[PDB]
Design an enzyme around this catalytic site. Structure first.
Site, mmCIF file in Angstrom:
data_model
loop_
_atom_site.group_PDB
_atom_site.id
_atom_site.type_symbol
_atom_site.label_atom_id
_atom_site.label_comp_id
_atom_site.label_asym_id
_atom_site.label_seq_id
_atom_site.Cartn_x
_atom_site.Cartn_y
_atom_site.Cartn_z
ATOM 1 N N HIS A 1 6.649 35.665 -29.013
ATOM 2 C CA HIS A 1 7.119 34.395 -28.473
ATOM 3 C C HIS A 1 7.564 34.399 -27.008
ATOM 4 O O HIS A 1 7.516 33.367 -26.328
ATOM 5 C CB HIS A 1 8.105 33.750 -29.434
ATOM 6 C CG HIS A 1 7.452 33.298 -30.703
ATOM 7 N ND1 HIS A 1 7.564 33.954 -31.908
ATOM 8 C CD2 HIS A 1 6.599 32.265 -30.931
ATOM 9 C CE1 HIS A 1 6.784 33.308 -32.809
ATOM 10 N NE2 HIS A 1 6.173 32.271 -32.268
ATOM 11 N N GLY B 1 2.297 49.243 -32.861
ATOM 12 C CA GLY B 1 1.361 48.149 -32.993
ATOM 13 C C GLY B 1 -0.087 48.535 -32.892
ATOM 14 O O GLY B 1 -0.912 48.021 -33.639
ATOM 15 N N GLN C 1 -2.048 34.121 -29.906
ATOM 16 C CA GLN C 1 -1.495 33.247 -30.924
ATOM 17 C C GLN C 1 -2.545 32.759 -31.898
ATOM 18 O O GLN C 1 -2.372 32.889 -33.107
ATOM 19 C CB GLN C 1 -0.841 32.042 -30.288
ATOM 20 C CG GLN C 1 -0.381 31.038 -31.297
ATOM 21 C CD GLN C 1 0.396 29.909 -30.673
ATOM 22 O OE1 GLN C 1 0.690 28.917 -31.330
ATOM 23 N NE2 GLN C 1 0.748 30.054 -29.395
ATOM 24 N N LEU D 1 6.338 42.691 -35.496
ATOM 25 C CA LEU D 1 5.908 43.341 -34.284
ATOM 26 C C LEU D 1 4.882 42.554 -33.436
ATOM 27 O O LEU D 1 4.626 42.905 -32.293
ATOM 28 C CB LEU D 1 5.379 44.692 -34.743
ATOM 29 C CG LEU D 1 4.809 45.828 -33.942
ATOM 30 C CD1 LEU D 1 4.885 47.080 -34.813
ATOM 31 C CD2 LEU D 1 3.406 45.490 -33.612
ATOM 32 N N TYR D 2 4.332 41.475 -33.981
ATOM 33 C CA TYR D 2 3.374 40.644 -33.261
ATOM 34 C C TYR D 2 3.970 39.247 -33.060
ATOM 35 O O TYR D 2 3.235 38.262 -33.006
ATOM 36 C CB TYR D 2 2.078 40.519 -34.057
ATOM 37 C CG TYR D 2 0.794 40.770 -33.287
ATOM 38 C CD1 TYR D 2 0.574 40.215 -32.029
ATOM 39 C CD2 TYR D 2 -0.210 41.565 -33.827
ATOM 40 C CE1 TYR D 2 -0.631 40.452 -31.325
ATOM 41 C CE2 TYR D 2 -1.407 41.810 -33.135
ATOM 42 C CZ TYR D 2 -1.612 41.253 -31.887
ATOM 43 O OH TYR D 2 -2.791 41.517 -31.217
ATOM 44 N N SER E 1 -3.190 47.565 -35.293
ATOM 45 C CA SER E 1 -4.218 46.807 -34.592
ATOM 46 C C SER E 1 -5.630 47.368 -34.703
ATOM 47 O O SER E 1 -6.526 46.696 -35.189
ATOM 48 C CB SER E 1 -3.833 46.644 -33.117
ATOM 49 O OG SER E 1 -4.272 45.403 -32.587
ATOM 50 N N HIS F 1 -3.156 34.147 -35.963
ATOM 51 C CA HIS F 1 -2.911 33.217 -37.049
ATOM 52 C C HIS F 1 -4.021 33.124 -38.047
ATOM 53 O O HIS F 1 -4.161 32.118 -38.726
ATOM 54 C CB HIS F 1 -2.483 31.850 -36.547
ATOM 55 C CG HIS F 1 -1.086 31.841 -36.023
ATOM 56 N ND1 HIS F 1 -0.583 32.868 -35.251
ATOM 57 C CD2 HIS F 1 -0.072 30.964 -36.191
ATOM 58 C CE1 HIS F 1 0.683 32.624 -34.967
ATOM 59 N NE2 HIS F 1 1.018 31.474 -35.526
HETATM 60 C C1 HEM Z 1 4.896 27.262 -27.777
HETATM 61 C C2 HEM Z 1 4.165 28.087 -28.721
HETATM 62 C C3 HEM Z 1 4.679 28.713 -29.864
HETATM 63 C C4 HEM Z 1 5.599 28.185 -30.704
HETATM 64 C C5 HEM Z 1 6.197 26.791 -30.602
HETATM 65 C C6 HEM Z 1 5.681 29.112 -31.847
HETATM 66 C C7 HEM Z 1 6.494 28.925 -32.936
HETATM 67 C C8 HEM Z 1 6.456 29.649 -34.106
HETATM 68 C C9 HEM Z 1 7.070 29.207 -35.320
HETATM 69 C C10 HEM Z 1 7.911 27.987 -35.537
HETATM 70 C C11 HEM Z 1 6.781 30.068 -36.268
HETATM 71 C C12 HEM Z 1 7.209 29.950 -37.744
HETATM 72 C C13 HEM Z 1 8.331 30.880 -38.243
HETATM 73 C C14 HEM Z 1 9.736 30.329 -38.004
HETATM 74 O O1 HEM Z 1 10.059 29.947 -36.855
HETATM 75 O O2 HEM Z 1 10.522 30.284 -38.978
HETATM 76 C C15 HEM Z 1 5.974 31.100 -35.599
HETATM 77 C C16 HEM Z 1 5.536 32.261 -36.211
HETATM 78 C C17 HEM Z 1 4.716 33.188 -35.652
HETATM 79 N N1 HEM Z 1 4.304 33.089 -34.351
HETATM 80 FE FE1 HEM Z 1 4.485 31.540 -33.093
HETATM 81 N N2 HEM Z 1 4.785 30.164 -31.765
HETATM 82 C C18 HEM Z 1 4.210 29.996 -30.519
HETATM 83 C C19 HEM Z 1 3.491 31.004 -29.907
HETATM 84 C C20 HEM Z 1 3.142 32.190 -30.484
HETATM 85 C C21 HEM Z 1 2.517 33.287 -29.808
HETATM 86 C C22 HEM Z 1 2.127 33.377 -28.346
HETATM 87 C C23 HEM Z 1 2.382 34.301 -30.657
HETATM 88 C C24 HEM Z 1 1.992 35.591 -30.361
HETATM 89 C C25 HEM Z 1 0.723 36.123 -30.766
HETATM 90 C C26 HEM Z 1 2.934 33.835 -31.884
HETATM 91 C C27 HEM Z 1 3.073 34.663 -32.996
HETATM 92 C C28 HEM Z 1 3.642 34.277 -34.166
HETATM 93 C C29 HEM Z 1 3.508 34.994 -35.385
HETATM 94 C C30 HEM Z 1 2.540 36.122 -35.624
HETATM 95 C C31 HEM Z 1 4.186 34.362 -36.327
HETATM 96 C C32 HEM Z 1 4.199 34.740 -37.800
HETATM 97 C C33 HEM Z 1 3.529 33.659 -38.649
HETATM 98 C C34 HEM Z 1 3.565 33.928 -40.163
HETATM 99 O O3 HEM Z 1 4.540 34.537 -40.660
HETATM 100 O O4 HEM Z 1 2.619 33.504 -40.864
HETATM 101 N N3 HEM Z 1 3.425 32.529 -31.768
HETATM 102 N N4 HEM Z 1 5.725 30.775 -34.298
HETATM 103 C C1 LIG Z 2 -6.266 51.448 -27.144
HETATM 104 C C2 LIG Z 2 -4.775 51.257 -26.935
HETATM 105 C C3 LIG Z 2 -4.010 52.456 -27.444
HETATM 106 O O1 LIG Z 2 -4.091 52.763 -28.655
HETATM 107 O O2 LIG Z 2 -3.338 53.077 -26.606
HETATM 108 C C4 LIG Z 2 -4.243 50.032 -27.593
HETATM 109 C C5 LIG Z 2 -4.840 49.556 -28.739
HETATM 110 C C6 LIG Z 2 -4.385 48.420 -29.332
HETATM 111 C C7 LIG Z 2 -3.321 47.713 -28.798
HETATM 112 C C8 LIG Z 2 -2.941 46.463 -29.403
HETATM 113 O O3 LIG Z 2 -3.801 45.628 -29.627
HETATM 114 C C9 LIG Z 2 -1.639 46.181 -29.753
HETATM 115 C C10 LIG Z 2 -0.592 47.100 -29.600
HETATM 116 C C11 LIG Z 2 0.612 46.495 -30.095
HETATM 117 C C12 LIG Z 2 0.380 45.173 -30.584
HETATM 118 I I1 LIG Z 2 1.787 43.985 -31.454
HETATM 119 S S1 LIG Z 2 -1.227 44.714 -30.423
HETATM 120 C C13 LIG Z 2 -2.703 48.189 -27.658
HETATM 121 C C14 LIG Z 2 -3.164 49.345 -27.054
#
Ligand code: HEM
Ligand SMILES: C[C@H](C(=O)O)c1ccc(C(=O)c2ccc(I)s2)cc1
Ligand code: HEM
Ligand SMILES: *[C@@H]1O[C@H](CO)[C@@H](O[C@@H]2O[C@H](CO)[C@@H](O)[C@H](O)[C@H]2NC(C)=O)[C@H](O)[C@H]1NC(C)=O
Ligand SMILES: *[C@@H]1O[C@H](CO)[C@@H](O[C@@H]2O[C@H](CO)[C@@H](O)[C@H](O)[C@H]2NC(C)=O)[C@H](O)[C@H]1NC(C)=O
Ligand SMILES: CCCCCCCCO[C@@H]1O[C@H](CO)[C@@H](O)[C@H](O)[C@H]1O
Ligand SMILES: CCCCCCCCO[C@@H]1O[C@H](CO)[C@@H](O)[C@H](O)[C@H]1O
Ligand SMILES: C[C@H](C(=O)O)c1ccc(C(=O)c2ccc(I)s2)cc1
Ligand SMILES: *[C@@H]1O[C@H](CO)[C@@H](O)[C@H](O)[C@H]1NC(C)=O
Ligand SMILES: *[C@@H]1O[C@H](CO)[C@@H](O)[C@H](O)[C@H]1NC(C)=O
Ligand SMILES: *[C@@H]1O[C@H](CO)[C@@H](O)[C@H](O)[C@H]1NC(C)=O
Ligand SMILES: *[C@@H]1O[C@H](CO)[C@@H](O)[C@H](O)[C@H]1NC(C)=O
Lengths: 551, 551
Positions: free
Chosen positions: B356, B494, B171, B352-353, B498, B175
């Site tokens: 949640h 992904g 997360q 794709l990332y 990545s 970000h």
């Molecule tokens: C309890 C923890 C978390 C909460 C409450 C949360 C909540 C949210 C919220 C509210 C948004 C804004 C978009 C919307 O809902 O309209 C968001 C976007 C996003 N979240 Fe989380 N999130 C959490 C954990 C995570 C985790 C673990 C990841 C995974 C890596 C993650 C990845 C994302 C991504 C990449 C976006 C896109 C942001 C953007 O468009 O700039 N979040 N999250």
């Molecule tokens: C090396 C390995 C592969 O390419 O198989 C690999 C590489 C990168 C990732 C990775 O970070 C991610 C794959 C999907 C998300 I969303 S992140 C996952 C696996």
């Protein structure tokens, strides 16, 4: 003293300071080892002990027309063309390195695109003399230095036959990537894009572009005078332009490059390119009725960028070089190479492209011969004479020799005075260092640099050490090649900055060099065929004598 | 109908419209010929008729620990590591192609960096159905679609043993490049940098950076609480933060990523990285007394970027993959490859990332178990418990399975509802298309996608056609690999986005991957050695259980 002032690191090694008195050279991938990156690797040693002098090479590239014509007809053309393109490019670093702010790699230097980048880090502000170690504590008075060796006494014309058409093209063209921010200071450019983004036609920012856009058929706003197409009025397209106070908006042409209004030669080329843009728009629409404004527009700009890169390489560069080898623009010659499709305008390249010596004594337009004071801000000459006429004249008037010394018309001698000063603010390193850096031997004396004993003597008493001779003065005073527009360094340092910023453009990548990118075969060919004559004559009632070479 | 709606161009061919009813596919360099880029080239045909399924590959990469240990000990590790890096990267275009604005290459798309780029052009607004040709005229109600298949009913935990420490890292990390501009609309990001610029630590703009900088010893402003280092107060470093109205500046931590204040997990990682930055600053100064603030700073940031890329590849990615092959971060494996050191965040990659599902039901910190409503905006938990404690807990609590379906805790189910809607605004193409595009076969039925008959049936009655199943829903509902955190597509789509955004960073280029770049051997090694344990334990009084794997 700052050990790094002694410039201890040879062959592109990096001088890293340590302790309060030590230093370490980083010779990673330099091809040398040792405390100062000097002990070469066997291969490096061969590679170097065999490189024929730039002089020999130049000689070969300008002789044996016969032998060359055959080569040009064989696959060997492509091979040499590819060689040049790569071997020339490796001299230029990518991603870029330093800027006026950081004489070290840094995320900010890499990302803050408002800075002009540089190849060699500045002479440290804590060095003994201004150029580092050698030279005097006081540098020659720019003004003097200029009136003595750069001030044109008698107009020496360029031997290559380069005319005004070329001088104006060069000027116009270079003003799309050299656009120093006066409010920001030296080392800051407004030309983010750092290359041939054809932004002197569309403006250097969205708003300005939108202002100049017609928003219909992909066209560019324009106006008719004497039933002919000329850029729109600042009244029609209310964009910021630089005209002297008092000139009315209804008498000013809106174009993209704010400065282009102060010289017909510029507004001339600005009219041709505009006409060309709207023309390509008509073709595209025929082929794609379904297309909208933006797409037609976006596509047209891509086609023109192609056209530009083409004409710049196959004609403009072909002329400046004087080579017999027919240069070629084929993005594919690099598809095998390890080449990064990215460019960043270097402060060194800007200086090195300050070709003011090209400007003649007077501007002749037929039997009529105009003065600088009649030319410089003339808002009528273009509409009066019209495209065709002006082209014919400029295509006939020969421009001056660039290198050699004392050939800069006094009307603009001030510019060169400024360039010298600015170089000092930038703290550019010594000419001799750049010589080495760009693959050359450093000059041993002033009399070696200039091909004589007179100027050499004075420069010696003025500078004190050849290893103190500055960049621009060294560039312009260095002795000219046989019958060339300039000498060894101007080409050997400029070529790299040049070809990199040309092939490095994204439309030259394998991703973009597809026919679909330009709207189909029609768009593509337009690019693959572009020529200075077609550029003109397909946008003019009559085709004049149009060339970069004086007839 | 728009012929291009039928998605006629196979194998990455480009669909160019012509006339008011025609189209032409651009199969340049596609490796296929024909009206729709289908007749393969002999080599292409071989290359493809031999590629072992993603499934087979995955199987091999997770079995025979013994055989793998040997491989890992031989040069073969490096070879496969290089293979992965390249073969994975070619799927991602560079320079980038389209954006929400232009479903065609265009100078603006290439230069206006405020747009998130995309791999596949949107479903044309003039198509029959929303997904193009197939499917119903009305897409499933996001909300419903979510409560039915994404709403966690019973917490399914991730089989790979991924814990909370990993979830928060992910997360926090993501970000820095996913930062959609709410004022600008979907498809516009504020994270210009489009990669690992470590900007969630230094702020996404000069001013904000300067605000957080100590401007002494390269350090970052900070504060002491209970005699420990925590980010500064919004009072000290008056930078914009997102905290609910009513929380005072003297209770808010200034960090760089405005949003990071609403969750201890984030502010935790933000504290570790800050501490780390100031620490590297002290090392650098020892080695370089002569260095000033900016240089120390600039250098420190470069060292951390290195550290980050390392830990992300060798530990974070090693964990998510579950492979036995010991992954390796060595920028040099690519020095032979034709690789462009440049990245641009794609809207597809952002969706794709949206992991949640990782978030648990409750947040346990020792015997104490906190609720979302106690965790979510808790301004005290961090200073109260302190780094070490929180790390130990997060390192022990296991996170949920990402793929599979019905495992997103209701507290944040709204997010997924939004993601679906946003995807529609972006007009993303169908899941099945992306499948093909990223080198996979398209699903023939809903029951093939999910590994069952129940959900498959409903999705069928809801969507109507598998070739209508959308991106995100298809991504999350597709059947999971054996004992994996997700399924085939999540990884096969992904991974490329990545690894490209990782190796593509400029410090990985031959120009920047020099020891001088990081201040010398000390800086360099710091990078070459970085580890999640060192990151923590060298900035904490005591070293807790620290890992991405639950114990
Ligand atoms: C309890 C923890 C978390 C909460 C409450 C949360 C909540 C949210 C919220 C509210 C948004 C804004 C978009 C919307 O809902 O309209 C968001 C976007 C996003 N979240 Fe989380 N999130 C959490 C954990 C995570 C985790 C673990 C990841 C995974 C890596 C993650 C990845 C994302 C991504 C990449 C976006 C896109 C942001 C953007 O468009 O700039 N979040 N999250
Ligand atoms: C090396 C390995 C592969 O390419 O198989 C690999 C590489 C990168 C990732 C990775 O970070 C991610 C794959 C999907 C998300 I969303 S992140 C996952 C696996
Ligand atoms: C009669 C015509 C010309 C005049 C009056 C002229 C004058 C100037 C002036 C006044 C400047 C501003 C810097 C200063 O003086 O302080 C300048 C800069 C420059 N000129 Fe010209 N010029 C002319 C022709 C050319 C030509 C032929 C070239 C060669 C390609 C050229 C290249 C440059 C370059 C590249 C700069 C740098 C601009 C920047 O820093 O943004 N000029 N010129
Ligand atoms: C790019 O770099 C320049 C120079 O560092 C930045 O301009 C300065 O920014 C600081 C902080 O905003 C100000 O104190 C200066 O007054 C600014 N102007 C100059 C001429 O230094 C510029 O903001 C940077 N641009 C970006 C986008 O980061
Ligand atoms: C990058 O693209 C966005 C979108 O085209 C530009 O933002 C718009 O710019 C136009 C002209 O200034 C305005 O009419 C809009 O109101 C702007 N905002 C949005 C959300 O569209 C943005 O200006 C471009 N940035 C640059 C640096 O060119
Ligand atoms: C007749 C053979 C033509 C080869 C042209 C290669 C491109 C020009 O070669 C140049 O030669 C100089 C001396 O080594 C160097 O300073 C340049 O970096 C190098 O690119
Ligand atoms: C045991 C051999 C390991 C080789 C790993 C290569 C990297 C993963 O290989 C992947 O396989 C899939 C099927 O061809 C494709 O979808 C991906 O684009 C490809 O990179
Ligand atoms: C191909 C030829 C070469 O590299 O020799 C060549 C290439 C480019 C140039 C060129 O455009 C320039 C050289 C110096 C300046 I200032 S522009 C000049 C010559
Ligand atoms: C390295 O360069 C410095 C400064 O020019 C010089 O004093 C020293 O002797 C050099 N060492 C070697 C091995 O050339
Ligand atoms: C401008 O050029 C015209 C010819 O086009 C000439 O007659 C006129 O005198 C010039 N104007 C000035 C102020 O020199
Ligand atoms: C090309 O694709 C279109 C649409 O799918 C189809 O109608 C046409 O028959 C295809 N042509 C070939 C040769 O496959
Ligand atoms: C915040 O967390 C602490 C433990 O650090 C807990 O005692 C407190 O009640 C929490 N605050 C809220 C509002 O839940």
């Amino acid at each position: 003293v700052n050990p790094c002032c002694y410039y201890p690191c040879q062959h592109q090694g990096i001088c890293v300071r340590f302790g309060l008195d030590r230093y370490q050279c980083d010779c990673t991938r330099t091809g040398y080892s040792g405390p100062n990156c000097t002990i070469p690797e066997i291969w490096t040693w061969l590679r170097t002990t065999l490189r024929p002098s730039p002089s020999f090479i130049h000689f070969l590239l300008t002789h044996g027309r016969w032998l060359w014509d055959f080569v040009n007809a064989t696959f060997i053309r492509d091979t040499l063309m590819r060689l040049v393109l790569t071997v020339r490019s490796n001299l230029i670093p990518s991603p870029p390195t330093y800027n006026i702010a950081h004489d070290y790699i840094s995320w900010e230097s890499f990302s803050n695109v408002s800075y002009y980048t540089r190849i060699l880090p500045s002479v440290p502000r804590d060095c003994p003399t201004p150029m580092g170690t050698k030279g005097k504590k006081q540098l020659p008075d720019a003004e003097f230095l200029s009136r003595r060796f750069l001030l044109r006494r008698k107009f020496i014309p360029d031997p290559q036959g380069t005319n005004l058409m070329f001088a104006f093209f060069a000027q116009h063209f270079t003003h799309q990537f050299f656009k120093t921010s006066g409010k920001m200071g030296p080392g800051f450019t407004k030309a983010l894009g750092h290359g041939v983004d054809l932004g002197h036609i569309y403006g250097d920012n969205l708003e300005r572009q939108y202002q100049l856009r017609l928003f219909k058929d992909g066209k560019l706003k324009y106006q008719m005078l004497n039933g002919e197409v000329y850029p729109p009025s600042v009244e029609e397209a209310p964009v910021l332009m630089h005209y002297p106070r008092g000139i009315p908006p209804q008498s000013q042409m809106a174009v993209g490059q704010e400065v282009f209004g102060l010289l017909p030669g510029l507004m001339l080329y600005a009219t041709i390119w505009l006409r060309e843009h709207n023309r390509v728009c008509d073709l595209l629409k025929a082929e794609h009725p379904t297309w909208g404004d933006e797409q037609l527009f976006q596509t047209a700009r891509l086609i023109l960028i192609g056209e530009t890169i083409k004409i710049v390489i196959e004609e403009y560069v072909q002329q400046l070089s004087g080579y017999f080898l027919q240069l070629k623009f084929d993005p594919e010659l690099l598809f095998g190479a390890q080449f990064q499709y990215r460019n960043r305008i270097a402060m060194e390249f800007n200086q090195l492209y300050h070709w003011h010596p090209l400007m003649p004594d007077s501007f002749r337009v037929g039997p009529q011969d105009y003065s600088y004071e009649q030319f410089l801000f003339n808002t009528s000459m273009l509409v009066d004479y019209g495209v065709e006429a002006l082209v014919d004249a400029f295509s006939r008037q020969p421009a001056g020799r660039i290198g050699g010394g004392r050939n800069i018309d006094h009307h603009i001698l001030h510019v060169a005075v400024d360039v010298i000063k600015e170089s000092r603010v930038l703290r550019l390193q010594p000419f001799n260092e750049y010589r080495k850096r760009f693959g050359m031997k450093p000059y041993t004396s002033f009399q070696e640099l200039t091909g004589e004993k007179e100027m050499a003597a004075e420069l010696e008493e003025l500078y004190g050490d050849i290893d103190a001779l500055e960049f621009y003065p060294g560039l312009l005073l260095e002795k000219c090649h046989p019958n060339s527009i300039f000498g060894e360094s101007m080409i050997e340092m400029g070529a790299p900055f040049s070809l990199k910023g040309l092939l490095g453009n994204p439309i030259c990548s394998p991703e973009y060099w597809k026919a679909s990118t330009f709207g189909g075969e029609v768009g593509f060919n337009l690019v693959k065929t572009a020529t200075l004559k077609k550029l003109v004559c397909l946008n003019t009632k009559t085709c004049p004598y149009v060339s970069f070479h004086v007839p």
